[PDB]
Amino acid sequence: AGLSFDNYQRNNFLAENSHTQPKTTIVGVKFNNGVVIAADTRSTQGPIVADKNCAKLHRISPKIWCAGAGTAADTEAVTQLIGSNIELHSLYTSREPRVVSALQMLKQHLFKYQGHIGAYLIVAGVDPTGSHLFSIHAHGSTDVGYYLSLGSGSLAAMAVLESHWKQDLTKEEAIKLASDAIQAGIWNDLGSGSNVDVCVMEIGKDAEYLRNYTP
Amino acid sequence: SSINGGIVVAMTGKDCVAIACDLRLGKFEKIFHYGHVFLGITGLATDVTTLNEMFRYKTNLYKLKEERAIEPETFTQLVSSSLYERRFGPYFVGPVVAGINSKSGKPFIAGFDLIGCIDEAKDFIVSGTASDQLFGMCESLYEPNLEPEDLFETISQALLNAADRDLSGWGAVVYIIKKDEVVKRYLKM
Amino acid sequence: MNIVPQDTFKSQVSTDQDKSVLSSAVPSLPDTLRQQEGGAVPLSTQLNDRHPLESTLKNWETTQRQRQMEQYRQIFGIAEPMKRTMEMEIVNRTDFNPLSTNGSIHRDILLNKECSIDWEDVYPGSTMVGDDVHSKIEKQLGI
Amino acid sequence: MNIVPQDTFKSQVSTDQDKSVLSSAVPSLPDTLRQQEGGAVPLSTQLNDRHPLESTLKNWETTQRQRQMEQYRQIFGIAEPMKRTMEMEIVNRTDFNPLSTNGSIHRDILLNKECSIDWEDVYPGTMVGDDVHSKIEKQLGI
Amino acid sequence: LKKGEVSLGTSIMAVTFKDGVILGADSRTTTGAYIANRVTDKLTRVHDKIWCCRSGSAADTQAIADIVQYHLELYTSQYGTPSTETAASVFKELCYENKDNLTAGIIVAGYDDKNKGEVYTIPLGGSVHKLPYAIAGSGSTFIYGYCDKNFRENMSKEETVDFIKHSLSQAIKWDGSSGGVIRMVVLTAAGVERLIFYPDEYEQL
Amino acid sequence: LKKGEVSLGTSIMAVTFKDGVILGADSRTTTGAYIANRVTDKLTRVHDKIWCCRSGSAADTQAIADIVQYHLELYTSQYGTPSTETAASVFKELCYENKDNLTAGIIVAGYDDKNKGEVYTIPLGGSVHKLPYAIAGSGSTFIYGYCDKNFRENMSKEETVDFIKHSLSQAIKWDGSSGGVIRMVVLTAAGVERLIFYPDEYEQL
Amino acid sequence: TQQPIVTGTSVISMKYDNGVIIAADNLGSYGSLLRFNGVERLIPVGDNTVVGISGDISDMQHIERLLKDLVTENAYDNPLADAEEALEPSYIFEYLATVMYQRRSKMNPLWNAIIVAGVQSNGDQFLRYVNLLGVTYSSPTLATGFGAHMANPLLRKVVDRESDIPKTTVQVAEEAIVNAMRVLYYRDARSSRNFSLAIIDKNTGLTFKKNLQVENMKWDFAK
Amino acid sequence: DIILGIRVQDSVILASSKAVTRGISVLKDSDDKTRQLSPHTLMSFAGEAGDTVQFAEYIQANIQLYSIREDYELSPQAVSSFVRQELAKSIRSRRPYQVNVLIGGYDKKKNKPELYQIDYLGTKVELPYGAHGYSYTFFLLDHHYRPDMTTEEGLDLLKLCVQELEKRMPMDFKGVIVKIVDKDGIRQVDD
Amino acid sequence: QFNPYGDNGGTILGIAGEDFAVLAGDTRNITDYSINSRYEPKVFDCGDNIVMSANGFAADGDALVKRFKNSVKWYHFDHNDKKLSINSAARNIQHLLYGKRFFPYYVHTIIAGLDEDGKGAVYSFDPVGSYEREQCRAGGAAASLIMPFLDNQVNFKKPLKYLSVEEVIKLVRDSFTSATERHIQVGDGLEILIVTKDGVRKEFYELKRD
Amino acid sequence: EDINVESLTQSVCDLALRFGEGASGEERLMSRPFGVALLIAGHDADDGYQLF
Amino acid sequence: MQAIADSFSVLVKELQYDNEQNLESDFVTGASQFQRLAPSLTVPPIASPQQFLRAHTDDRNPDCKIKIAHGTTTLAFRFQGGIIVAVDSRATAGNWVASQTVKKVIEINPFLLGTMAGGAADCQFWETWLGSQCRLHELREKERISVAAASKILSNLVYQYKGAGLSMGTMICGYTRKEGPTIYYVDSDGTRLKGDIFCVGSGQTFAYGVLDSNYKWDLSVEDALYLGKRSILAAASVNLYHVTEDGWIYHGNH
Questions:
Q1: In terms of Cα–Cα distance, which of H24, H42, H23, H33 is closest to H1?
Q2: Which of chain A's termini has less CB crowding within 10 Å, N or C?
């Protein structure tokens, strides 16, 4: 039951006998009435560009979104499992899901596997308690931030965010700031490129998903 | 008795797809079908046979329950979940899925990593040991919205050029897939 | 009050440690044909070269529930863990469905997993010997 | 101003690096017979697997002498190290004793080792060579 | 620690004074030489007047703190407000029984009517020590002498605030893993008071 | 650091004041947890009013100090009394040119009628830094804050003595490799003064 | 050396229309301990060149000694040392790069990263980088260490190509450098608040500013 | 590489095998494991490629120089002592290399044959028997050896050893070259 | 232990024509994820109508080019300003590379020029000196993307002999544009040196990422 | 390639200089000048047939 | 004495240009680096140069890896009036186009040939060096060098560097009046074997068997060439060389 450990010894033996086992800029910015998440759209299998238009913004729930780095399959699987749990909990409670609930589920699931599930996430959302932004580490640690960056291009994006962030930001200002950080990651990092995807979650409104906001 | 490795190439045409695999001429082919969905697997041969048997099992049960054939997107999701089940003991394979949806008629191709991460491509997918040289040949030769004859010629030329650049009993198997007719061809070099 | 499972290794081994598949000809030896493991799997091979996370994953839920029972005993008394264990035992005992492996609804209600999904649920996890109802009847009844 | 000797490893190798023993038939190759080293000792084997202290011991006294000369140059001027080196070179060049290997008395006085003993003093230490004429050729440069 | 895990290079102080206790910390989280969070709240609330600060593995300390808060809610539903000693004992049991798999150290500061404010420290390993004041973290090593020279029993609130401010300012000055703002919580009979001091304040002390 | 060698785990301080400089240290030499020498004079004289204290490998620093004293005797025979800067430069050259083979750190204190008392520090690696005061050794880490809070320029002799005594007493209190008696040398224009303080005196500070 | 002990973090430099600007903070860190405050890591070599060095501090002092010896040997014995026979930035960089590569090939590298900034005698701007491996390159913006990942993306906003150099005034370049230094002090754990800056202009010469502090820091968004 | 040496009443018999270096198909007719040191002293060697041939040729050159210089032939004992000295000197400052030497001579002054074996570290032993390479033959030699054997009986014993050894060799054992050293000099046995 | 090597990630291409030679390279210098510079030439005119490029570890390539240029200077001094032919330069470079047999340069080297008959010539060198004359050689990252593109449009067996210089320049630009699209290390610019009987001419073309 | 006849002649003359300081600054190699004169006859592509 | 004064009179040290070898290698004082009959090889100045070279020679760029000579079959034998040397010319393609065909056999002299069978650079460099040595010897002695002497020179040279990192297996084939036709095999381990028939390659057992089936000393030139071509074809188009007393003659696909 669950994830299998079969063929572990066989795979190790193959690795010992010369059998090669076969084998991003993300930002989140809070503003005065919501939160924005943005990402680059380049997908590479090593130095080769596999896809120039890749959707990296994933939906935990209609108003709770996330993006990830690290092992891609782990990120997708964990996001989908927590989305299923969140949907079931919302149906059970007859209430809108809270971002803190998704944070707790993700934290406990990642801590259970002791860092062997390589999922590093930025999770933004809006619920009846307000707007929330969180960063989640593979080993099970989480943090709260007003603006966060992730991926190989995270340092350039963080520099841009540190240059042009204020307490009181409008929706347009936050969208521009997030897009600028993603553009800096695109220009100055080899892992990031192509287009920018944005998602804006405002209190009291539907989530607005803008794919290819700047091409 | 040594049949490990190989190359599989998938391309999209106008309203058709092409999927081709290498062969040793002269019964071990790396392309299987479960109705109108085609799967080509490269890598460890034991894992290839095991995955083929498992997917035949699961698609037979799916058709018995649903009373209809499975579509390429649903099969892609199934392959992804099956590969992820063996998270810590994964098969040493690279799979590629090709097909045409029975209802919408849109062509579909995709590739996978060893633990089921999906790479859905609009132009072509290359799987194999090198995946760097034949990849460049396919990049130089591919053109979008080709007719089935043009697509067959393009993919066959890519395979032949890959075969010439690094043998003796080399062969190829090509599938040209349309919504109503599937043509299987052999290339003897 | 554990968090990570502890004391998972076996402190001793024997050739008749698995009472289910003991040979009838030589009762002190296991029956390799009815094990249906492949025919070349000595028990000693299971003592080495394991994944360091397999034991943690296998015993995680039991460890969490044992910590919860210890907390109840510390805060409420002996009666609360006694009653929880009694309910779980009654639910588990009176279920015998040899054709299915899915857990019951009432067990998930008691475990507070009514609207919770894990990979164990998603991946619940042919043979010539011992794939019949009668083997399960014998195991359940201790025949 | 070095205490422990430094830069003791070779940076280049060649088959004619030993000018004293070179083959007359092939001047680019060394003469194995006249080397008299056992006949199965390629130069490459001397580049690896040495005792770490050997280079430190072999170059110790030269390093101390160089540090002393550098201190004299810093404190006294160019003339003092120049004169010390000139004295030592004259003493060493005028001595030629092919039958003995001991250092002269005047060399010991200049080195300030008149009443000092080290293991080099206690332990000072074929078919071809090891004769007077080989030493004459090596000394005269012919 | 585990390879690739997040460590807690903090500066933590807890000082008992005449009217209660004060718990203070810096707000830097690092991933080596890169500051991943300029402003992190290191003051963890375990109960209404029982707070703590954490060191070692971040994930392990978060899991332990969540379990302890759950435990204290269960205790409160039965017997009411728990003592700081009970919370310290639960922390100690969790840290000691799992010390072969989890790296965790805790500083617990509490107030209750019976004991009038207490400080406990649980270093790595799981032993517990009740102290008039405690310091922990990477920067604490630089202020062992200063604190030993400047602590008095039964100080006023302002004196304790100044003492903690000076000590943490020195710890921030010398330690590279200690950061920007100083956060403090004052626990007395009146209630819970939160204070923050900015670099332009304490760097001129 | 070669295996089986002797390391200089100590607490070293040097403070410039109004009339000159003072150099102070503890007197403990330890091999592992065993105190190999309970009473050690760590204040090394390389010239009449130029003293030093050593850290790192004991043998390497002893050899370097012998060479420095020889160099300064040659310089004196040629040009007279050297400045503290010259001795610091010779120490730095010796430590830097051999840093791949020797582990040495030096604190140099000196007096001359031109510069009027100076302190230089050469940490491991061979870089030189001139400071109004310096601390070094394993026990110095615990008094980085205290010293930074209690040093004033142009202090009197007694104030400097008290400052050094307090700081070294705290370092002794917290560091295992430090202990014994406190030794101090006062270098002024009036001459060289020697001071010793016993545990029954400074432990009551 | 074989491992750095006392180190400096980053130097950042930019070209503008009439000259170059370089900057670096004043800190020598001993592991995680911020041990030495007051380390000058910008060395003016003449009146037309500034060298910024990051990495091992003892090796940096050795390089300073080499530069001083080079300056002194320039005047031995040319009476036109202050005249057209003065040292050029290209000469200094060529010497330093040769030294760095030779010591890399000797397996005894100088654990440093070096930026040479200045103005040639014909008014051209010179900005070059060389590290402990002997790798050399030039660009309108240069940085070492953490700056190379954070300060460079900011500065490339101002000067993105060679055609942007004539459009960039000294005020804009200095503002960009100061903001990049503030970002570095925000996000670098081995950084210092105090830094030094140097402007080399083909008209006004060398301006060396010391004791510059990061100012206007936003900490109020605590909660 | 396999070398055998048998000393009999009047002579010394030395048998050596071919090389077959590494996967190289070579057809040749020569003995590359034997050097004639002097008209009445022969040397057989087995060991690492390159080093062993260099050492053997160096020894041969030194002995030829001595013979030309003195117009006189060294005894087998002196030759073996010189070989031992040179072998111990070679590994004085380098990692030892695998080498085993059998020296067979006929002392004309004493009028008697002699056989010595020197191993890789420089250990010289005077023996009536001797073998190096494949590892039983000692038991057979001990069972069927007499100090007063004639040349024919020694050759028969060597044939018995060869027949015993061939049954374990992987069928690639080609013709073993056999040489005899006695008062008339050195000759090669055709069979 | 100190590691004396590195990697800077370039791409070079040499093509020999009927009466001309072409050596081109991308101008981006990177350190494994970061862009050190967007314009750093790697193809150099060495005199006597010889163009050289050493792609890989940048310090080693710079050292090799420096040594070759100094050797050519002394060759002119010692032989009455005689023109150095391309084959002689190839032999000199082979000796320069093999002189570091036990501490090799970590570079791939290509030189281009005209032979004694006036025809285009390109020589490729392995890192320890093994060299050969070739019609076309692509080196570095994305060579596997550039060679098939060239082979798709040229019959090396329109035949390459009858191609003009402008057509070759356009084909090189197209191959580099495709490689820039598909490869993350290729971009920011392309520089082409053309050797003809009139000398060496330089062309520059901007690539993606600016 | 073949060496130029003039280059070879220059090399021989540089060797003949060795009774004093060498052309590249080498130390003295012999105690007296040579007592021979040479006629060097060659052909190369640069200068045809030459006699030195 | 003035030189002594100069040594103690005070940039050059850091450049390491006070050493004559460094000046020569960088061509400061002249082109003497290109004047050494015995080339100088740079070695890392550390305690374990061999481990360093071995570790760094097995680690990413395909174009920065040391080129290895083809392991394809190579054959050589001597019938009655010369030597037949046969190779397979099936070149291996890569990211390049060849202007002309490559050759697996090095032409040392108009009378000497060698085979690579190892590291390509080692074989090319050292066989060109051997050609230089043979030319100098022939100029000195006014006679063609014997094949034994040339093979011995190559073997001594490779043995001097034994264990340093070289890899090369070559077959020196020649024909002189005094010796006749001779073939030697020289390896980077110092092996030097004289022989009549040599087969070194991926598949060489088949070629050796075909040779042994129909090998005789009374073969004619055409028969010997046909036998060599057939042996190569059996092993796995075919470049042939016939070596006689007057030199070698090359046959493309005869």
A1: H33
A2: C
Residues of F with CB under 8 A from a CB of G: 96, 99-100, 123-129, 141, 144
Q: Give the domain range for residue K244.
A: 72-254
Q: Residue E132: name the closest of E112, E154, E114 by CA.
A: E154
Identify whether the C-beta of residue K190 lies closer than 8 Å to the C-beta of residue H53: yes
Contact call for residues E10 and E55 (beta carbons, < 8 A):
yes
Q: Is G62 on the interface with F (CB under 8 A)?
A: yes
F128 found inside a domain = yes
CA-wise closest residue to D102 among D78, D121, D77, D127 = D121
Distance of CA K94 to the CA centre of its chain: 23
Please give the Cα distance from B100 to B37 (Å, whole number): 7
Closest residue in B to K91 (Cα–Cα): B166
Residues 6+ apart with CB under 8 A from I155: none
CA-nearest of I47, I55, I102 to I72 is I47
Chains in contact with H via at least 3 Cβ–Cβ pairs below 8 Å: D, K
Unique residue bearing structure tokens 């029993």: E153
* Count of structural domains, chain I: 1
Q: In whole angstroms, what is the distance from residue I100 CA to residue K96 CA? A: 25
Measured distance CA(D109)–CA(D117) in Å, rounded: 13
Distance in angstroms (rounded) separating the CA atoms of residues D18 and F102: 34
Q: What is the dihedral of CA B17, B23, B25, B28, to 10 degrees?
A: -100
Q: Is K149 marked within a binding site?
A: no
Locate the domains of chain B by residue range: 1-189
From first CA to last CA, the distance across chain E in angstroms is 36
Omega of the bond prior to G77 within 30 degrees of 0, cis?
A: yes
Of G70, G62, G17, the C-alpha closest to G46 is: G70
* Domain annotation covers residue K57: no
Task: Note down the domain range covering I150.
Answer: 1-210
The answer to whether I34 faces chain G, any CB pair under 8 Å, is yes
Q: Domain containing E66: what range?
A: 7-205
CA distance K105 to K76: 11
Q: In E98-156, which ranges are continuous DSSP H helix?
A: 144-150
Q: How many helices (H) and strands (E) does chain J have?
A: 1, 2
Is E76 among the domain residues? yes
Q: Does residue K58 lie in a domain region? A: no
Tokens representing E184 are 């403090």
Query: How many structural domains compose chain E?
Result: 1
Residue F204 inside a domain? The answer is yes
User: How is I13-65 classified by DSSP, letter by letter?
Assistant: EEEE-SS-EEEEEE--EEETTEEEES----EEE-SSS-EEEEEESHHHHHHHH
Is there a contact between A162 and G220 if contact means CB atoms under 8 Å apart?
no
Count of positions (residues) in chain K: 254
Rounded distance between C-alpha atoms, residue B151 and residue B11, angstroms? 8
Among H residues 28-57, those touching chain K with beta carbons less than 8 Å apart? 28-30, 32, 49-51, 53-54
The reply to whether K125 falls in a domain is yes
Q: Closest Cα to residue H113, out of H122, H123, H103? A: H103
* CATH number for K145: 3.60.20.10
Task: Name the amino acid, one letter, at I64.
Answer: L
Q: Are H134 and H168 in contact (CB under 8 A)?
A: yes
CATH of the domain at E58: 3.60.20.10
Q: Is residue E2 part of a domain?
A: no
Is E121 among the catalytic positions?
no
